[PDB]
Design an enzyme around this catalytic site. Structure first.
Site, PDB file in Angstrom:
ATOM      1  N   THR B   1       0.857  -1.297   0.000  1.00  0.00           N
ATOM      2  CA  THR B   1       0.000   0.000   0.000  1.00  0.00           C
ATOM      3  C   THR B   1       0.813   1.232   0.000  1.00  0.00           C
ATOM      4  OG1 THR B   1      -0.527  -0.208   2.463  1.00  0.00           O
ATOM      5  CG2 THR B   1      -2.059  -1.099   0.816  1.00  0.00           C
ATOM      6  N   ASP B  17      -5.180   1.869   0.084  1.00  0.00           N
ATOM      7  CA  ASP B  17      -5.807   0.916  -0.755  1.00  0.00           C
ATOM      8  C   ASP B  17      -5.859  -0.385  -0.092  1.00  0.00           C
ATOM      9  OD1 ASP B  17      -3.404  -0.727  -2.349  1.00  0.00           O
ATOM     10  OD2 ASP B  17      -2.730   1.302  -1.807  1.00  0.00           O
ATOM     11  N   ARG B  19      -5.363  -3.642  -1.735  1.00  0.00           N
ATOM     12  CA  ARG B  19      -4.629  -4.741  -2.301  1.00  0.00           C
ATOM     13  C   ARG B  19      -3.575  -5.270  -1.315  1.00  0.00           C
ATOM     14  NH1 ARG B  19      -1.729  -4.914  -8.473  1.00  0.00           N
ATOM     15  NH2 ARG B  19      -2.223  -7.029  -9.059  1.00  0.00           N
ATOM     16  N   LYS B  33      -6.548  -1.827   5.221  1.00  0.00           N
ATOM     17  CA  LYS B  33      -5.338  -1.661   6.045  1.00  0.00           C
ATOM     18  C   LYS B  33      -5.410  -0.314   6.573  1.00  0.00           C
ATOM     19  CE  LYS B  33      -2.434  -5.026   3.263  1.00  0.00           C
ATOM     20  NZ  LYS B  33      -0.970  -5.372   2.955  1.00  0.00           N
ATOM     21  N   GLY B  47       4.132  -0.712   4.532  1.00  0.00           N
ATOM     22  CA  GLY B  47       5.289  -1.504   4.848  1.00  0.00           C
ATOM     23  C   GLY B  47       4.686  -2.875   5.174  1.00  0.00           C
ATOM     24  N   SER B 129       4.930   2.632  -0.692  1.00  0.00           N
ATOM     25  CA  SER B 129       5.676   2.216  -1.803  1.00  0.00           C
ATOM     26  C   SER B 129       5.415   3.156  -2.922  1.00  0.00           C
ATOM     27  CB  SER B 129       5.253   0.737  -2.345  1.00  0.00           C
ATOM     28  OG  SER B 129       3.863   0.618  -2.733  1.00  0.00           O
ATOM     29  N   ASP B 166       2.864   1.716  -9.961  1.00  0.00           N
ATOM     30  CA  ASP B 166       3.466   1.040  -8.949  1.00  0.00           C
ATOM     31  C   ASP B 166       2.557  -0.118  -8.714  1.00  0.00           C
ATOM     32  OD1 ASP B 166       4.797   0.292  -6.118  1.00  0.00           O
ATOM     33  OD2 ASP B 166       5.736   2.249  -6.512  1.00  0.00           O
ATOM     34  N   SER B 169       0.568  -1.163  -4.883  1.00  0.00           N
ATOM     35  CA  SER B 169      -0.684  -0.513  -4.664  1.00  0.00           C
ATOM     36  C   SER B 169      -1.485  -0.966  -5.753  1.00  0.00           C
ATOM     37  CB  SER B 169      -0.586   1.044  -4.630  1.00  0.00           C
ATOM     38  OG  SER B 169       0.222   1.558  -3.603  1.00  0.00           O
TER      39      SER B 169
END
Lengths: 126, 226, 204, 249, 244, 195, 241, 242, 196
Positions: B1, B17, B19, B33, B47, B129, B166, B169
Site C-alpha cells: 500500500t 488501498d 490490495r 489496512k 510496509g 511504496s 506502482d 498498490s
C-alpha cells in the site's frame, strides 16, 4: 519473608521441634524390624472407616527407589513433600554418579531437609 | 500500500488501498489496512502488514486508557509519541510505517512516522511504496486550504497513480474523511478502478470427477450424547 | 533452505455458502525423503478447523499451543470459540515471538455458528490477517493453488459442489508440488455435521 | 528490610476471614446504589453527594465506563474505587483486547476483578478494597447480565440487587417491582423512586447519577460507514435527561 | 517494625496442631453441604448452595460446580473466593499435563498438586491456607472412576461416598446404610437428593438451590459425558425421584 | 556410527543400534551400546552427534523413570515420545540444540499392540510401521515397504532385518561394526546377537 | 489492637490511621482561599512568620509544579515537599509520553491514587498534606481540584482550607448565590486578587500585610506569583476600591 | 499508644519518635550559622572533655563540594552518614548538570532523604540537625535542616544546648546591622556568641572553631579560619565578655 | 542539511534548513531542525532525524523537571544533559547538535556537540553536511559582536551557500532570534535568498 517461625529458647531448645515430636506421637504407628535377609515395614492404616476405597487412598509406605522404601508417622500433608524431594534426588544420583542411592544417603538427605528449616527463619520445621 | 494524507481547513482526509501483497505474489484482492488508533484518530498502515496492525492494536489499548483517565477525546500528538518511543527501543527493528491523521478539540493534524522513529510534519504527507507516485499528482493541482469536496477527489486521484505506476498498490481506494464537528466517514470503495472480468465458462462438474478413497463421519458438532 | 520450505506441504480453504471446506495433504518429510503419510495437518477446536503449513517442529508446537488456549476458553466461558476470535488469538501468539519468529502459515477456517456465516482467514509468519471470503491459500506451492483457486471458484456453492472444487484445486497443486502427493484429506464442514473424506491421489 | 508477607486477612477461631467482614461494614457506611436488569437494557443508579456547597458534582463521577458496553458503580470508600476503576480498565485490555481483539464478556470481566480483590486479601501489606461493585454489562453471547462483586473476592449474578447503606430496604422495593418482563423505561422509574428513599438531600437530576447499559448509540460510535460495529451500549445520562425521567415518575 | 505486627500465624501448638488449619475447618462448616457418591457407571456430585434468594439469579450460577478439565470437575464447599484461585491453577496444571504427554491427566495427579500448595502456605510465607474442601469427580482409564476429598491442610483421601462442608456427620451416616456397590448412576441420583433432604440447610430443599452434575460413561463408544444439569432439568428429576 | 533402525511388527518392536563409536578421526570402540532402556517394555535408542546423545539420553532416562516408579504406571510409548519431543522442540529455540534423533519403540500395555515412533532431531514425532534416521536409513527404506506386511511376526521381521544390514555393508561408505538387536517384546526387553 | 496503629479495617469499617492524617493539616494554622475568576484562578494563603531570624522570602507554601499549574499546601512542610517532588516528576513524565503537559484534573487524580496506595500499605505512612491545585487549562478553563490525604479529590467553584475555613465558605457562598454562576465575573486578574483579599479580611477578621500574604495567580498559559512589592500594590488598591 | 514506631500516628498530630530524636540534637554541641552579605560564617563549640585530647584534630565540620560548609549536632555517626549521603548528591548534580550544586537545590535533596525514614518503620528516623550554606550563583544562602525534614531560610540559626544564648544575640546582631554585615566582621561576632553560649556549658571547657565560605575572603570556597585571625576572634570575644 | 549558530552583540541567532531526506528521495521539505528544549535556549538537529529527535525529548524531559525544582537553566546546563547522554550511546547513536541560548547574565552562547559526546563552546558553530563547504566563508565573513542586521544577512548568505553546494539542504531558511527582548521567528523563501 524471613520473620522467624523458629527461634532459640531460654531452655536451649526450639519450641517447635518439641511440638513437632508430639505431632508424630499422635500419628499412626509404624514398626520396623529387620531380619538377616529382609527389612519389614508394617504400619497402622486408618481404613476402619466405611465408604472408603483403599485402592485410590494413599498408602503409608511409599517406595522412593527400587530398593529403598520409606514409611512415615505424623502429618500426611507434610510427608508427601519429603517423598517427592527424595525421589527427585534419587534419580539425580543415577544421572551424575550412576547407580541408585544408598539407604544411608537418603537418610541423610531427608534429615537435611528438616535441618534447613530448623535453623532458618520464616519457616517452621515439619 | 501507499497512504496519502491531506490536511486542509475543514478536516483531514486519509486514503490508502486494499490490495494485499505478500512479495510479488498478491495474497488478497481485498483487505483494508486502515486502522483506528481512536474513533477519531484513524491511521492507515504501510510496509509490513503485521508490524503496523500489531502496534495499532497495542497502543490502541493505551490511548483508550489514557482517554478514560482524562474523560475527554485523546490528542493526535499522543498517538505519535506512544509510537515514537516504542519503535526507538528496538532500534528500528519494527517495520511500522504509519500516517497518523486525526481530529480532536484542538483541531486537525497530520503527521507521519517512519520505522526508525523519525517524525515529520506537513500539509501533505505521503508514505509507503507508491509515495513517489502519489506526490507527483498532488503538487500541481493543490493550493493551501481546500474543502473536503475538492480534497477527496484530489487524494483519490493520487492513490490512482500508485495503482498504474506502482504495483505495490492496487485495487479499491478506501477513504476516511475525519471532519470537525461530525463523526469520521469511512467511505470504503469510493473508487473501484478495475474488477475481474467475467469468464466465458463455469468449471462445475458432476460427482466423481474427483477421485475418493473412502469417507467417514467425524463430529465435534456435539460433545457426545447418552 | 528457509525453515518453511524444508518441510513444505500445502493447505487450501474455500468458503461455500452455509458450509466451508479446508483440505491438506498428508505428506510431511525432511529434504526430499517423504517420511509419513500418517500425519495430517488439520486439527480442530469446537467447530473451527486449523490447517498449518511450514516447519514441522513449529506445526506440532503450535498444535499444542492452540489446543491449550482453546481449552481455557471452552471451560471459562462455557461456550465454544468463534472463528473470528480464534484468528486474533492465532495472530497474537505468533507475534510474541517476534524475534526468532515462527516459520508457518496458519489458515483459519470455520463457520461462525451464530449467523451461520462462513469464515476463512490466512496467516504468514508473525501475523498479518488476511481477509478473504473466497479462498485462502498457503504452503510453498501457494502459487500453484492461487492460480487454480481463482479460476475454478464462483461465488456461493452448495456443499456438494464445494467438494469438487476444493478437491480439484488440491489435486493438481499437490502432484505439481514435490512435497505433496502422499495422501490427502478434505473436511466438508457443515454446521449440522462434518464429513471427512479421504481422497485417492496419484503417486508423486 | 520488609517482612510483610504474613496475610492480614486470616481465619478466626469462630471461622470466617475477619478482615473482609470489617471491610463489608465500610460498604454499608457508603452511598446507596442499585441496579435493575430489564429484558431490554440494564439501569444502574447511585446518588451524588458533596461535603461542600462549593464542590461541583459534575466533576464527580461514581458511575464510570470500563468498556463501551460494560459500566460499573460502587458503594463503599471513594479512594478505593478511584484506584480500582483504572485497574479494571487495564486488565480488560491486557486479557482480552490484545488477545482476542475485543472488549471482554461481562462474565469474564467480573471474574478478573474478583481476582484483584482476592490477591489484595492475600499476603501482608495489603488490606481489601472496601467497596462492593455492581457491574452491569452486555455481551453478545449471554445478553444482559447484572453482577455484584463482593469485597470477599467472589461475585454473584442477580436479577436485581442493591448495595450500600440503604440496600436492605431498596431490595425489598425491587422485589415487588421486578417481573419476568420489564421495560428499560419503567426500570428507570423504579430505580429513581427507590433511591428517593435512600437520599436525604436533593433529588434533582443534577444530584442523582443515572446510567443505562441500554442499547447501542451510533452517535457515540465516533465513526460511520462501518455498519458491522455497534456503538456504546452504555450511555451515561446528563442531568437534564435525568430530570425528564423524574417528571416521568 | 515488620515483626511488631506479626503474631507468628502458622506454627504448631503444644499438641502439634496448626492453628490456621484448625480455624479453617470451622469456616468450611459454615459453607453448604456437598456430597459425592461414586457409582459403578459414574460419579454424582450434588451440592446445596449456601445462598438462596428470589432476587438471586441461580439459573446461570455454577458457583459450586466448575470443570477443571474435560473428565474432571469439582464441587466446592468452603470459601468461593479462596477456591477460585485453586480452580484456575488446576485448569493450568491439567492443560500442562496434556501439553507435555498428550494424554489426559489422571485424577490422582491433579489432586496431589493442589494439596502441595495448601501445605506450602503453612510451611512458609506466613500465608493463610485455602479454606475449602473439594470433592473431585474424575474419570481416568487406569483406575476408572475415582472419588477424592481434600481438606484445607493439604491432604487427599479416597472414598466411595463422602460429604464435606455443612452436615458432614449426618450425611455420612445415611450414606453408610444406603450405599451399595451395585448402585448405578440412576440409583446414586436418587440417594443424593434424599440425603440432602435430610441434611437441608434451611427448612426446604429446592431445584433452584440445587446444583447437580454427573459424569457418565453412558455416552456412546465408552466416552464420558460431563453434564451439569440446569435447575429446570434438576426440577424434572425432582419430580422423578419424588422429592416433590 | 549413526545407524538406528526400527521395524514394528504385530507383537513387538525390533530396534538395532550401532556398535561402533568414532570420535575424532579414529574408531575408539568397536563394541558399544547407543541405546538405553527407559521402562520395562519401553526402549529408547538414540544417535546423532557426540555427546548430545550420552547426556540427553540419561536425562530422559531419569524423567521417565521418576514418573513410572512413583505412580507405578508404565507410560504409553505415546506419552513417552511426547515428552522427549517437548524437550527436543524446546532446545532448538534455546542456546544449546541437542543433536539427537531417537527411535522410541515400546510395547503399549493399554493397547496390547507395539508402537514405534520416529522423532527427528527438531522434535516432531510420527508413528510408523518401521523407521530410520540418518543417510543410512535412506538405503534401507526401499526394502521395508517391499517385504513388510501387516501380519509380520518377530521371526519375519528379524529375517527382514538381515537383508537391511547386509545392504548397509555394501552401500554405506563407513562400517558400523555390526548391530545390537534388541527386541521389545511383551515379556520384557531381550537382546539377541543376530545381525 | 492494631486497627488504629496500621491501615487495616476496624469493626467500624473506618480507618483511624487515615483520620489522624486530617488531624495534622490544621495544626499548622494556615488558611487558604481560592477563587475562580473569568480568565484566571487566584489563590492567596497565610505566611505567618513570627521570627526575626527566619527569612520570610524562603518561607513559602506555593510551589510551581508545572509552568501553568500552581499548588498550594496546607499542612506540614516535609510532606509538602515530597508531594511536590512526586507531582513535578509525573507532570514532566506526562509531557514525555503523551506529548502534552499533564492536566490539573489528572495530576490531582494521580496524587489521589498514590495516597490510597500509601494507606493500602501498612508500613507506609500517607503524606499528611491537603493539596490545592490551581490552573487555567484550555479544556477545563479556570479550575481548582483539591486532593486530600486519603486519596479523594473533586473539582470546585471555589474552596478554602485551614481551621477557620468555615468563615471563608460563608463569603464565597453569598458571592456565588448572588451572581448565580460558578465563578467571579471579573475580567482583570488583578481585581480578582483584590476581591480575594477582601473576603479573607471579612472571614478571619484579620488585617493582612504583604508579609502575611503570599499570592499565586494562574492566568491563561502561565503561572506566576506576586512578590511582596506587588502584593503591597494590591493592599493599597483595597483603599482605592 | 501511638509511639511504638513512626507510622503510627495520633489525633494530636504528634509523631513521637521524631520529636524524641530532636532531644539528642538539643543536648548536642552548640553550633551557629550567621547569614552574612558575602557568605556565611559557621562556628561550633567543640567541648574539651580531657587534657588527653589532641586540639583541632577532631572536626564536626566536613566540606561538601568545594563551597558548602556543613556542621551538625546530635549523634555524630548519624550526622556523618547524612553528610556522606550529601557528598554523593553534590557529585551527582556535578555529573549530570556539570555545575557545583546550588545551595537551595542541595537543601531539597537532603529534605527528601530525611523524609524517607519517617515514612517507614523498617528504618529508623534521623536525629541530627545540620546547618549548611555557602556561596553559589544565586547569592549566599543559609539553611538549617531539622530531622523532621523541614528547612527554611535563616538570617541566623543555632542548635545545641546553648541555642538560647546564641539566638538572643543573633537578634541583636540583625539589629546592629539590619542592612547586613561583612563576613570578615562576622568572624568576631561568631566568636562572641559561642563564648556567651558557653555560659550554658560553664561546667566544661571548650575550643573555638570557626569556618567560612564567603566571596569576599575565600572567593566562594569553604575554608577553615585558623592562625592569627582565629586568635583575634578569641581575643575579641574575651574582652567583650569581660 | 546545514545549520549554524553565531553569537552576536545582543544575543544569538540559530539558523537551519527544514529539508529532511531519506536517500535520493526528499522525505519532507518542511520538517524543522529548530527544536525548543527550553523556551529561551533552543537547539539544532542534524545527522539522522530519528536519533536526535528522540534524545531531544529526553533532554527536554529533565529540563522540565530542572526548571520546576531549581529554577531556570542556563545554556551550559541544557548542553550538558545532551553531552553526557551521547557519551553513553555513542557506539549506538549519532547526532549533530548545536545548543545555543540566551541567558541574561552571559548573553548569547553557542555550544556544539559531535557524536562522541564532546561539548565545545565557540563564537560560531556549523554542522550538517553542508557545514564543510561554508566553513571558509564563515570565518572569513563573521565579525565579533556585530549588530542584528549584519547577523541576519550573514546567516542568510551562509545558508544560501550551503544550499548551492549541498543538495541535501534547501526547503526554506528558518531562523530563531533569541535576544533579550524574546523569541522572533524568521522564514526566508527561496526567491529571496537565491538573489542574495
Amino acid at each position: 519473608y524471613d520473620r522467624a517461625l523458629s527461634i532459640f529458647s531460654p531452655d536451649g531448645h526450639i519450641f517447635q521441634v518439641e511440638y513437632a515430636l508430639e505431632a508424630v506421637k499422635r500419628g499412626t504407628c509404624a514398626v520396623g524390624v529387620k531380619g538377616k535377609n529382609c527389612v519389614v515395614l508394617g504400619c497402622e492404616r486408618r481404613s476402619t472407616l466405611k465408604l472408603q476405597d483403599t485402592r485410590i487412598t494413599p498408602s503409608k509406605v511409599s517406595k522412593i527407589d527400587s530398593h529403598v522404601v520409606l514409611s512415615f508417622s505424623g502429618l500426611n500433608a507434610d510427608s508427601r513433600i519429603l517423598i517427592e524431594k527424595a525421589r527427585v534426588e534419587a534419580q539425580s544420583h543415577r544421572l551424575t554418579l550412576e547407580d541408585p542411592v544408598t539407604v544411608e544417603y537418603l537418610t541423610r538427605y531427608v534429615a537435611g531437609v528438616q535441618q534447613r528449616y530448623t535453623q532458618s527463619g520464616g519457616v517452621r520445621p515439619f | 500500500t501507499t497512504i496519502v494524507g491531506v490536511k486542509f481547513n475543514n478536516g483531514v482526509v486519509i486514503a490508502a488501498d486494499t490490495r494485499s501483497t505478500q512479495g510479488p505474489i498478491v495474497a488478497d484482492k481485498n483487505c483494508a489496512k486502515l486502522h483506528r488508533i481512536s474513533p477519531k484518530i484513524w491511521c492507515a498502515g504501510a510496509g509490513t502488514a503485521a508490524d503496523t496492525e500489531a502496534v495499532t492494536q497495542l497502543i490502541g489499548s493505551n490511548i483508550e486508557l489514557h482517554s478514560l483517565y482524562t474523560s475527554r477525546e485523546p490528542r493526535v500528538v499522543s498517538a505519535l509519541q506512544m509510537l515514537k518511543q516504542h519503535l526507538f527501543k528496538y532500534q528500528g527493528h519494527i517495520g511500522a510505517y504509519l500516517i497518523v491523521a486525526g481530529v480532536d478539540p484542538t483541531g486537525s493534524h497530520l503527521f507521519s512516522i517512519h520505522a526508525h522513529g523519525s517524525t515529520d510534519v506537513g500539509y501533505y504527507l505521503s508514505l509507503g511504496s507508491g509515495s513517489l507516485a502519489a506526490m507527483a499528482v498532488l503538487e500541481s493541482h493543490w493550493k493551501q486550504d481546500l474543502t473536503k469536496e475538492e480534497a477527496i477527489k484530489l487524494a483519490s486521484d493520487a492513490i490512482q497513480a500508485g495503482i498504474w505506476n506502482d504495483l505495490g498498490s492496487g485495487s479499491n481506494v478506501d477513504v476516511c474523511v475525519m471532519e470537525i464537528g461530525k463523526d469520521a466517514e469511512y467511505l470504503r470503495n469510493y473508487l473501484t478502478p478495475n474488477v475481474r472480468e467475467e469468464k466465458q465458462k463455469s468449471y462445475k462438474f458432476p460427482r466423481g470427477t474427483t477421485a475418493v478413497l473412502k469417507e467417514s463421519i467425524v463430529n465435534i458438532c456435539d460433545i457426545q450424547e447418552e | 533452505s528457509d525453515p518453511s520450505s524444508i518441510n513444505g506441504g500445502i493447505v487450501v480453504a474455500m468458503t461455500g455458502k452455509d458450509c466451508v471446506a479446508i483440505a491438506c495433504d498428508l505428506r510431511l518429510g525432511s529434504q526430499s525423503l517423504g517420511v509419513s503419510n500418517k500425519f495430517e495437518k488439520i486439527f480442530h477446536y469446537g467447530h473451527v478447523f486449523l490447517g498449518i503449513t511450514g516447519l514441522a517442529t513449529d506445526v506440532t508446537t503450535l498444535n499444542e499451543m492452540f489446543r491449550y488456549k482453546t481449552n481455557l476458553y471452552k471451560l471459562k466461558e462455557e461456550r465454544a470459540i468463534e472463528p473470528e476470535t480464534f484468528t486474533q488469538l492465532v495472530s497474537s501468539s505468533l507475534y510474541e515471538r517476534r524475534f526468532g519468529p515462527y516459520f508457518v502459515g496458519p489458515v483459519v477456517a470455520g463457520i461462525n455458528s451464530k449467523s451461520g456465516k462462513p469464515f476463512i482467514a490466512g496467516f504468514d509468519l508473525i501475523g498479518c490477517i488476511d481477509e478473504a471470503k473466497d479462498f485462502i491459500v498457503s504452503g510453498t506451492a501457494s502459487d500453484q493453488l492461487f492460480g487454480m483457486c481463482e479460476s475454478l471458484y464462483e461465488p456461493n456453492l452448495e456443499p456438494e459442489d464445494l467438494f469438487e472444487t476444493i478437491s480439484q484445486a488440491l489435486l493438481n497443486a499437490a502432484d505439481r508440488d514435490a512435497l505433496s502427493g502422499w495422501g490427502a484429506v478434505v473436511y466438508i464442514i457443515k454446521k449440522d455435521e462434518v464429513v471427512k473424506r479421504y481422497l485417492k491421489m496419484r503417486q508423486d | 528490610t520488609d517482612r510483610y508477607s504474613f496475610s492480614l486477612t486470616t481465619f478466626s477461631p469462630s471461622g470466617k476471614l475477619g478482615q473482609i467482614d470489617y471491610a463489608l461494614t465500610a460498604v454499608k457506611q457508603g452511598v446507596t446504589s442499585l441496579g435493575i436488569k430489564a429484558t431490554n437494557g440494564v439501569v444502574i443508579a447511585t446518588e451524588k453527594k458533596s461535603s461542600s456547597p462549593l464542590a461541583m458534582s459534575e466533576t464527580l463521577s461514581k458511575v464510570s465506563l470500563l468498556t463501551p458496553d460494560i459500566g460499573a458503580v460502587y458503594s463503599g470508600m471513594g479512594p478505593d474505587y478511584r484506584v480500582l476503576v483504572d485497574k479494571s480498565r487495564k486488565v480488560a485490555h491486557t486479557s482480552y483486547k490484545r488477545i482476542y481483539g475485543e472488549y471482554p464478556p461481562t462474565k469474564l470481566l467480573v471474574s478478573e476483578v474478583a481476582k484483584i480483590m482476592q490477591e489484595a486479601t492475600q499476603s501482608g501489606g495489603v488490606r481489601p478494597f472496601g467497596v462492593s461493585l455492581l457491574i452491569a454489562g452486555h455481551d453478545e453471547f449471554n445478553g444482559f447480565s447484572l453482577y455484584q462483586v463482593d469485597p470477599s473476592g467472589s461475585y454473584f449474578p442477580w436479577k436485581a440487587t442493591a448495595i450500600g447503606k440503604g440496600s436492605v430496604a431498596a431490595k425489598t422495593f425491587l422485589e415487588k417491582r421486578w417481573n419476568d418482563e420489564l421495560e428499560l423505561e419503567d426500570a428507570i422509574h423504579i430505580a429513581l423512586l427507590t433511591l428517593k428513599e435512600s437520599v436525604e438531600g436533593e433529588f434533582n437530576g443534577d444530584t442523582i447519577e443515572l446510567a443505562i447499559i441500554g442499547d447501542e448509540n451510533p452517535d457515540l460510535l465516533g465513526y460511520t460507514g462501518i455498519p458491522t460495529d455497534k456503538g456504546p451500549r452504555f450511555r451515561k445520562l446528563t442531568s437534564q435527561e435525568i430530570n425528564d425521567r423524574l417528571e416521568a415518575l | 517494625g515488620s515483626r511488631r505486627y506479626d503474631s507468628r500465624t502458622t506454627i504448631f501448638s503444644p499438641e502439634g496442631r496448626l492453628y490456621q488449619v484448625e480455624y479453617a475447618l470451622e469456616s468450611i462448616s459454615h459453607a453448604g453441604t456437598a456430597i459425592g457418591i461414586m457409582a459403578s457407571d459414574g460419579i454424582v456430585l450434588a451440592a446445596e448452595r449456601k445462598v438462596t434468594s428470589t432476587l438471586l439469579e441461580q439459573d446461570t450460577s455454577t458457583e459450586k460446580l466448575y470443570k477443571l478439565n474435560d473428565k474432571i470437575a469439582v464441587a466446592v464447599a468452603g470459601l468461593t473466593a479462596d477456591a477460585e484461585i485453586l480452580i484456575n491453577t488446576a485448569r493450568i496444571h491439567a492443560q500442562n499435563y496434556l501439553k507435555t504427554y498428550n494424554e489426559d491427566i489422571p485424577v490422582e495427579i491433579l489432586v496431589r498438586r493442589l494439596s502441595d500448595i495448601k501445605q506450602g502456605y503453612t510451611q512458609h510465607g506466613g500465608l493463610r491456607p485455602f479454606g475449602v474442601s473439594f470433592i473431585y469427580a474424575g474419570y481416568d482409564d487406569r483406575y476408572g472412576y475415582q472419588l477424592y476429598t481434600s481438606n484445607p491442610s493439604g491432604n487427599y483421601t479416597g472414598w466411595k461416598a463422602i460429604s464435606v462442608g455443612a452436615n458432614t456427620s449426618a450425611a455420612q451416616t445415611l450414606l453408610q446404610m444406603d450405599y451399595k456397590d451395585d448402585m448405578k448412576v440412576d440409583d446414586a441420583i436418587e440417594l443424593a437428593l434424599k440425603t440432602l433432604s435430610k441434611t437441608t440447610d434451611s427448612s426446604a430443599l429446592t431445584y433452584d438451590r440445587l446444583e447437580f452434575a454427573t459424569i457418565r460413561k453412558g455416552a456412546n463408544d465408552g466416552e464420558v459425558y460431563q453434564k451439569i444439569f440446569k435447575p429446570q432439568e434438576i426440577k424434572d428429576i425432582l419430580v422423578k425421584t419424588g422429592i416433590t | 556410527m549413526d545407524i538406528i533402525l526400527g521395524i514394528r511388527v504385530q507383537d513387538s518392536v525390533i530396534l538395532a543400534s550401532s556398535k561402533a563409536v568414532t570420535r575424532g578421526i579414529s574408531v575408539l570402540k568397536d563394541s558399544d551400546d547407543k541405546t538405553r532402556q527407559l521402562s520395562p517394555h519401553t526402549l529408547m535408542s538414540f544417535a546423532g552427534e557426540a555427546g548430545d546423545t550420552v547426556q540427553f539420553a540419561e536425562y530422559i532416562q531419569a524423567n521417565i523413570q521418576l514418573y513410572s516408579i512413583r505412580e507405578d504406571y508404565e507410560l504409553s510409548p505415546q506419552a513417552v515420545s511426547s515428552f522427549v519431543r517437548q524437550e527436543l522442540a524446546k532446545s532448538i529455540r534455546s542456546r544449546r540444540p541437542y543433536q539427537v534423533n531417537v527411535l522410541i519403540g515400546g510395547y503399549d500395555k493399554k493397547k496390547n499392540k507395539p508402537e514405534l515412533y520416529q522423532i527427528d532431531y527438531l522434535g516432531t514425532k510420527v508413528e510408523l510401521p518401521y523407521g530410520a534416521h540418518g543417510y543410512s536409513g535412506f538405503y534401507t527404506f526401499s526394502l521395508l515397504d517391499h517385504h513388510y506386511r501387516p501380519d509380520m511376526t518377530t521371526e519375519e521381521g528379524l529375517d527382514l532385518l538381515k537383508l537391511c544390514v547386509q545392504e548397509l555393508e555394501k552401500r554405506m561408505p563407513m562400517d558400523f561394526k555390526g548391530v545390537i538387536v534388541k527386541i521389545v517384546d511383551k515379556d520384557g526387553i531381550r537382546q539377541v546377537d543376530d545381525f | 489492637g492494631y486497627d488504629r496503629h496500621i491501615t487495616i479495617f476496624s469493626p467500624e469499617g473506618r480507618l483511624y490511621q487515615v483520620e489522624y492524617a486530617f488531624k495534622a493539616t490544621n495544626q499548622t494554622n494556615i488558611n487558604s482561599l481560592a477563587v475562580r475568576g473569568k480568565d484566571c484562578t487566584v489563590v492567596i494563603s497565610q505566611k505567618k512568620v513570627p521570627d526575626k531570624l527566619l527569612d520570610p522570602t524562603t518561607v513559602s507554601y506555593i510551589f510551581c509544579i508545572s509552568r501553568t499549574i500552581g499548588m498550594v499546601v496546607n499542612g506540614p512542610i516535609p510532606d509538602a515537599r515530597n508531594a511536590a517532588l512526586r507531582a513535578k516528576a509525573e507532570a514532566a513524565e506526562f509531557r514525555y509520553k503523551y506529548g502534552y503537559d499533564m492536566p490539573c484534573d489528572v495530576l490531582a487524580k494521580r496524587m489521589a491514587n498514590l495516597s490510597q496506595i500509601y494507606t493500602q500499605r501498612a508500613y507506609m505512612r500517607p503524606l499528611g498534606v491537603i493539596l490545592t491545585f490551581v490552573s487555567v487549562d484550555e479544556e477545563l478553563g479556570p479550575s481548582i481540584y483539591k486532593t486530600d490525604p486519603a486519596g479523594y479529590y473533586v473539582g470546585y467553584k471555589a474552596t478554602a482550607t485551614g481551621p477557620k475555613q468555615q468563615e471563608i465558605t460563608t463569603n464565597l457562598e453569598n458571592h456565588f448565590k448572588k451572581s448565580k454562576i460558578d465563578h467571579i465575573n471579573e475580567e482583570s486578574w488583578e481585581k480578582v486578587v483584590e476581591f480575594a483579599i477582601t473576603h479573607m479580611i471579612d472571614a478571619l477578621g484579620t488585617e493582612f500585610s504583604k508579609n502575611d500574604l503570599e499570592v499565586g495567580v494562574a492566568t491563561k498559559d502561565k503561572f506566576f506569583t506576586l512578590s511582596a512589592e506587588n502584593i503591597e500594590e494590591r493592599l493599597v488598591a483595597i483603599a482605592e476600591q | 499508644g501511638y509511639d511504638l514506631s513512626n507510622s503510627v500516628f495520633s489525633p494530636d498530630g504528634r509523631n513521637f519518635q521524631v520529636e524524641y530524636a530532636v532531644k539528642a540534637v538539643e543536648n548536642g554541641t552548640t553550633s551557629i550559622g550567621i547569614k552574612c552579605n558575602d557568605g556565611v560564617v559557621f562556628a561550633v563549640e567543640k567541648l574539651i572533655t580531657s587534657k588527653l585530647l589532641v586540639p583541632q584534630k577532631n572536626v564536626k565540620i566536613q566540606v561538601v563540594d568545594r563551597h558548602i560548609g556543613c556542621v551538625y549536632s546530635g549523634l555524630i555517626p548519624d550526622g556523618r552518614h547524612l553528610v556522606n549521603r550529601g557528598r554523593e548528591e553534590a557529585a551527582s548534580f556535578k555529573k549530570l548538570y556539570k555545575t557545583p550544586i546550588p545551595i537551595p537545590a542541595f537543601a531539597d535533596r537532603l529534605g527528601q532523604y530525611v523524609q524517607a525514614h519517617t515514612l517507614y518503620n523498617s528504618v529508623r528516623p534521623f536525629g541530627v540537625s545540620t546547618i549548611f550554606g555557602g556561596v553559589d550563583k544565586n547569592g549566599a544562602h543559609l539553611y538549617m535542616l531539622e530531622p523532621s525534614g523541614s528547612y527554611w531560610g535563616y538570617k541566623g540559626a543555632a542548635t545545641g544546648k546553648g541555642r538560647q544564648s546564641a539566638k538572643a544575640e543573633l537578634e541583636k546582631l540583625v539589629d546592629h546591622h539590619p542592612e547586613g554585615l561583612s563576613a570578615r566582621e562576622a568572624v568576631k561576632q561568631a566568636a562572641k556568641i559561642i563564648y556567651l553560649a558557653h555560659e550554658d556549658n560553664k561546667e566544661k571547657d571548650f575550643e573555638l572553631e570557626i569556618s567560612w565560605c564567603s566571596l569576599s575572603e575565600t572567593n566562594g570556597l569553604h575554608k577553615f579560619v585558623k592562625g592569627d585571625l582565629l586568635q583575634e576572634a578569641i581575643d575579641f570575644a574575651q574582652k567583650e565578655i569581660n | 542539511t546545514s545549520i549554524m549558530a553565531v553569537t552576536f552583540k545582543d544575543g544569538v541567532i540559530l539558523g537551519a534548513d527544514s529539508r529532511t531526506t531519506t536517500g535520493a528521495y526528499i522525505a519532507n521539505r518542511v520538517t524543522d531542525k529548530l527544536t525548543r528544549v527550553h523556551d529561551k535556549i533552543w537547539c539544532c538537529r542534524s545527522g539522522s532525524a530519528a536519533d536526535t529527535q528522540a534524545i531531544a525529548d529526553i533532554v527536554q524531559y529533565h529540563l522540565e523537571l530542572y526548571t520546576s525544582q531549581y529554577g531556570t537553566p542556563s545554556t551550559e546546563t541544557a548542553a550538558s544533559v545532551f553531552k553526557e547522554l551521547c557519551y553513553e550511546n555513542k557506539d549506538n547513536l549519532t547526532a549533530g547538535i548545536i545548543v545555543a541560548g540566551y541567558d541574561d547574565k552571559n548573553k548569547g552562547e553557542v555550544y556544539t556537540i559531535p557524536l562522541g559526546g564532546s561539548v565545545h563552546k565557540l563564537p560560531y558553530a556549523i554542522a550538517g553536511s553542508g557545514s564543510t563547504f561554508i566553513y571558509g566563508y564563515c570565518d572569513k565573513n563573521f565579525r565579533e559582536n556585530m549588530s542584528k542586521e549584519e547577523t541576519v544577512d550573514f546567516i542568510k548568505h551562509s545558508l544560501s551557500q550551503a544550499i548551492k553546494w549541498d543538495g541535501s539542504s534547501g526547503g526554506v531558511i528558518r531562523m530563531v532570534v533569541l535576544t533579550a527582548a524574546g523569541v522572533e521567528r524568521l522564514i526566508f523563501y527561496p526567491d529571496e535568498y537565491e538573489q542574495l
